[PDB]
């Protein structure tokens, strides 16, 4: 059985809100000029530290610790960059034109031009942040989407875990419950649920592009990646 399947909507939200990882700082030294290598180093340094908090957060996602360790590994290996990206976009929501990687690392798109191939991904991330802003995405909806990404992105490459689908279904119930409570009409509710879920497809897209870009930086020796990052990259296969 699973203490996730009998949680109420309000207990689901509450559980996921308290699991939230902290905001981390960049080790940014504002006394040297940015280079391609130095910015990539800042970016992957922070990513590596967020990864550790993500692993801790995933285990607090209702239902996640029910799974096997091998399934947990697959899931995080599949979704990690997507999860980093959705948090960033959410952090950046009320900073139009900017990406808040950290409170001491707020970058506009022109600063993204420092790394080659970067600005394209920055633009997609910024447009997603803008989309979240026009939709007026709420924190509670955000924690649900972020959890959906964790459970769903790797689920089809389990080569049937209906327990994963049970939990994903409960998060669906949870999102609609939050929309009902927010005063949305029945049709607005399903309309919004689609709008939010359709954005997950753009986040997958951004994740794949970013993974090809990260692989590319590794293969050109622009930046040394932590063994954890090297392992996360490896779970995916690129050229």
């Amino acid at each position: 059985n699973s203490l996730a399947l009998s949680l109420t909507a309000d207990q689901m939200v509450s559980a996921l809100l308290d699991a939230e990882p902290p905001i981390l700082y960049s080790e940014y030294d504002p006394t040297r000029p940015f280079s391609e290598a130095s910015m990539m180093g800042l970016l992957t340094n922070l990513a590596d530290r967020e990864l550790v908090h993500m692993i801790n957060w995933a285990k607090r996602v209702p239902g996640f610790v029910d799974l096997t360790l091998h399934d947990q590994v697959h899931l995080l290996e599949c979704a990690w960059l997507e999860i980093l990206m959705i948090g960033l976009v959410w952090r950046s929501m009320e900073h139009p034109g900017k990406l808040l990687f950290a409170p001491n690392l707020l970058l506009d798109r022109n600063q993204g031009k420092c790394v080659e191939g970067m600005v394209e991904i920055f633009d997609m991330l910024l447009a997603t942040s803008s989309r979240f802003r026009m939709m007026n995405l709420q924190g509670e909806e955000f924690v649900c989407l972020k959890s959906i990404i964790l459970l769903n992105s790797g689920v089809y490459t389990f080569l049937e875990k209906d327990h994963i689908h049970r939990v994903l279904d409960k998060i669906t119930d949870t999102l609609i419950h939050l929309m009902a409570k927010a005063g949305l009409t029945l049709q607005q509710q399903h309309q919004r649920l689609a709008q939010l879920l359709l954005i997950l497809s753009h986040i997958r897209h951004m994740s794949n592009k970013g993974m090809e870009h990260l692989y590319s930086m590794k293969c050109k020796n622009v930046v040394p990646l932590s063994d954890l990052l090297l392992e996360m990259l490896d779970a995916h296969r690129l050229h």
Partner: peptide, 9 residues
């Protein structure tokens, strides 16, 4: 596997 280790720590 670092991930595997981090997940049981």
């Amino acid at each position: 596997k670092i991930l595997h280790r981090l997940l049981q720590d």
